[PDB]
Amino acid sequence: MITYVFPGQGSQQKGMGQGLFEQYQHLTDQADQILGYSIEKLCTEKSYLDVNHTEYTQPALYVVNALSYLKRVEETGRKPDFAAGHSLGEYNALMAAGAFDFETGLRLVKKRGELMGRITGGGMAAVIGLSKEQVTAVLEEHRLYDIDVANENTPQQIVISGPKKEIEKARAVFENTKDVKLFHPLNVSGAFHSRYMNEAKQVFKQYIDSFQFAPLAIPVISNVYAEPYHQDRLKDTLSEQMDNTVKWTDSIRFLMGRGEMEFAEIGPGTVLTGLIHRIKN
Template identity: 35%
Template sequence: MSYAMLFPGQGSQAVGMLSGHTDPIIRATFDEAAQALGWDLARLVAEGPEAELNQTARTQPALLAAGIAVWRLWQARQLPAPVALAGHSLGEYTALVAAGSLDFGDALRLVELRGQLMQAAVPAGVGGMAAVVGLDDAAVEAFCAEYAGEGVLEPANYNAPGQVVVAGNVPALEWLEREGKAHGARMVVRLAMSVPSHCSLMREAADRLAERLAQTPVNAPAIPVRHNLDGQVRVDADGIRQALREQLYRPVRWATTIAQLKGEGVGTFLECGPGKVLVGLNKRIAKDAVSFALEDAEGVDKAAAAVKA
């Protein structure tokens, strides 16, 4: 059975994540991550505090480590490899580690820096993100284009049909909330994110991240990785570095990525990491596909049985 492995991004973190796994691979991976980073990632994941785990510079390496821990546990089953990998936003780095394109330690330090740069680019309280539900992509784009006030308002995540996340400055997001129903949106929901990811406010952060990326070894992926920019595969180091740079200030084309994989015959998707966010989105993008979350041992067992079938 051909299947794709998907890695979640920010929003999937929680204190105690992956506690449904008892395999020592999980703790060993967290400990390895702690050595690479110089702080106790395993303790933070297990005990919190939640406020610290939710700091972008902590969230990103914690989620990357969680995704790789589950990936290693999955590999230990010696099952057929996925035909493709993809990751939502931060999850793209996890996918590249799983594919052998980035070293685990290098990637952890990269995403820690990525989080620091994102936090520094837009001070807390200045920017954020909101989900627009009930409008198609073109309608959301037109809605954002109508904003005539100060600041930025741009589509950031094309997550699924009828769900687009918008990023920008707080006054622009407040306008979006006020005008939502008049523009046909079923709802506009502010997200618990102080960093406006995947919009032009992150351009400077992307340029600074590119300096570190230029110094980071990048290999050709052993498994094709679909990139957020366009759902396409890249195999050359410079192309991968450029995609990671642009990903920070351009929209995540998640619905396009999943639809392309489905159109190429992929009928099963596995979410590799904590939570079920991507499984939920898949129900709206590829309704007749089968999706499994590997967030606990039971999920891994069910997915393994399906892949073997």
């Protein structure tokens, strides 16, 4: 058994998906027309749009993952038994699983990127060394009720999310707690995957409802439940994702429980392979 997993924000990098664009020139052209710019140039030319700006990152990641998948499947002959993606990457898993088509995913992640891109006054930080239980305790003991858990990445990598000044207060807390190895603020200015994504979540819910969704060929493990998408709640499970924890350690657990399980990371970088190794350890 094998699982294809799709990376999210932080895996992009100029040169990503080099040579795959002209191989799927229809998809590239379709992406160009939906986006209003050259998706090949976003991905691979240092002279054009900065791929690190979330509004562009998500379409860049989404297109590169999509195409990397089509190539893998063509090349191995094998379609995966499960699919999962981290935050942005979930949209590649639903799409590979047949929930919607290339175009539909890209429209979705364009609006995702744009809405995420206007979020302001926020901050996220990775805390390494403590459990999600432990992070929760400390947050509260120290009266930081404003910070949410945005990412459960390994059993001891937790990303926190809140107002900018709140992330700064927590620095002092986490860097003076036993078992914390690292506090590393993320290079973002929105409190993603937290209560502060509320209005954006909604605006984005209404957008999701506007599309017709197909049934899944592959089981997709949801970021929100660490469980497979229940086929009747597809839109609801996806719309719940914006302002809820990415439950990634547990989504990788569920897949290990499924049998003798292989993971392959489709898309740029080895970020998820990393998290999978540490979850497996």
